[PDB]
Structures are given as C-alpha cells and as structure tokens.
Amino acid sequence: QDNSRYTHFLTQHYDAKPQGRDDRYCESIMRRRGLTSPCKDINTFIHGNKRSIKAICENKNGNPHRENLRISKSSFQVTTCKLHGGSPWPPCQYRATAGFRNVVVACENGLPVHLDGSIFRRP
C-alpha cells in the first residue's frame, strides 16, 4: 500500500476538483496543505483524477524525461500559486495562474513522488 512519499506528493500537488482558481484559491489551499511556514515561493497543483496521474509512471501516460523523470502524454488542468511580496513568513500572498499542459514527475515503485515545478516558473 502507497508509501508516505506518494501520499505526501498528493498533499502538496493534487486537488481533484477546485472551484475558482483565482488568487484567493491559492492563498487558502497553501494554508490548508501546510505550505505556509515558511511560505513556499511557488507551488503547482494538478487537477483531475488520480488515476491519470499515477499512469504517468507507466508507458500508458508517460515518457522518460531528462535524467530520471517522466513527462506525461496527456494534458492536465493545473494551477500555479506564486508568492507575492518580500517575506518568507505568514501571511503569504499568492497570485494564481491557471494552465492546461502536460506535467513532469519523478516515480518510485510505480508511484509519483515528486513534481518538477521548474516548467511552471516562467522567468
């Protein structure tokens, strides 16, 4: 049964069915998931069904990527929360950006355990 790292990945990166994906959504979910002490600089949540996300670890929905990651074949609805302001401590103000594209994860024992957030921080 699903080890702690996969469980942790879901806590930090999965929100099945969000409502509005605006700035207030970000500020609330970041607190709720305990990512505000200190405030995480940027964090992305994937939406949809868990099934498609786990499938990225297989050839059904993923391709090998770079040194040790996997990239999905299907696109996902996602929301990236970016810290606004110059302080790492609460209150954390976040700005939301909704998107729809494929994602990159690291798999361990057939389960997603890490999300590569670099493809979401548009410099």
From Swiss-Prot:
Enzyme active site: 13, 114
Function: Secreted ribonuclease that can either promote or restrict cell proliferation of target cells, depending on the context. Endocytosed in target cells via its receptor PLXNB2 and translocates to the cytoplasm or nucleus. Under stress conditions, localizes to the cytoplasm and promotes the assembly of stress granules (SGs): specifically cleaves a subset of tRNAs within anticodon loops to produce tRNA-derived stress-induced fragments (tiRNAs), resulting in translation repression and inhibition of cell proliferation. tiRNas also prevent formation of apoptosome, thereby promoting cell survival.
EC number(s) from the headed UniProt entry: 3.1.27.-
Effect of residue 17 to E: In ALS9; reduced ribonucleolytic activity
Main subcellular location of this protein, as a coarse class: secreted
Consequence when changing residue 100 to I: In ALS9; uncertain significance
Enzyme class: hydrolase
Expression by tissue: Expressed predominantly in the liver. Also detected in endothelial cells and spinal cord neurons.
Outcome of swapping residue 31 to K: In ALS9; marginally reduced ribonucleolytic activity; wild type far-UV CD spectra
Similarity comment: family membership: Belongs to the pancreatic ribonuclease family.
UniProt gene name: ANG
Protein name, per record: Angiogenin
Positions of post-translational Pyrrolidone carboxylic acid modification: 1
Effect noted on mutating residue 40 to I: In ALS9; reduced ribonucleolytic activity; low angiogenic activity; reduced mitogenic activity; moderate reduction of thermal stability
Motif (Nucleolar localization signal): 31-35
Subcellular location(s) of the protein: Secreted; Nucleus; Nucleus, Nucleolus; Cytoplasm, Stress granule
Molecular function in Gene Ontology: actin binding; copper ion binding; DNA binding; endonuclease activity; heparin binding; peptide binding; protein homodimerization activity; receptor ligand activity
Chain sites annotated for binding tRNA: 21-22, 81, 103
Activity-regulation annotation: Has weak tRNA ribonuclease activity by itself due to partial autoinhibition by its C-terminus (residues 140-147), which folds into a short alpha-helix that partially occludes the substrate-binding site. In absence of stress, the ribonuclease activity is inhibited by RNH1 in the cytoplasm. In response to stress, dissociates from RNH1 in the cytoplasm and associates with cytoplasmic ribosomes with vacant A-sites: ribosomes directly activate the tRNA ribonuclease activity of ANG by refolding the C-terminal alpha-helix.
Effect noted on mutating residue 12 to A: Slightly decreases binding affinity for RNH1
Variant or mutagenesis effect after changing residue 22 to G: In ALS9; homodimerization is similar to wild-type; localization in the nucleus is similar to the wild-type; strongly reduces ribonucleolytic activity
Subunit structure: Homodimer. Interacts with RNH1; inhibiting ANG ribonuclease activity. Interacts with PCNA.
GO BP field: actin filament polymerization; angiogenesis; antibacterial humoral response; antimicrobial humoral immune response mediated by antimicrobial peptide; cell communication; cell migration; defense response to Gram-positive bacterium; hematopoietic stem cell proliferation
Keywords associated with the record: Amyotrophic lateral sclerosis, Angiogenesis, Cytoplasm, Developmental protein, Differentiation, Disease variant, Disulfide bond, DNA-binding, Endonuclease, Hydrolase, Neurodegeneration, Nuclease, Nucleus, Protein synthesis inhibitor, Pyrrolidone carboxylic acid, Secreted, Signal, Stress response
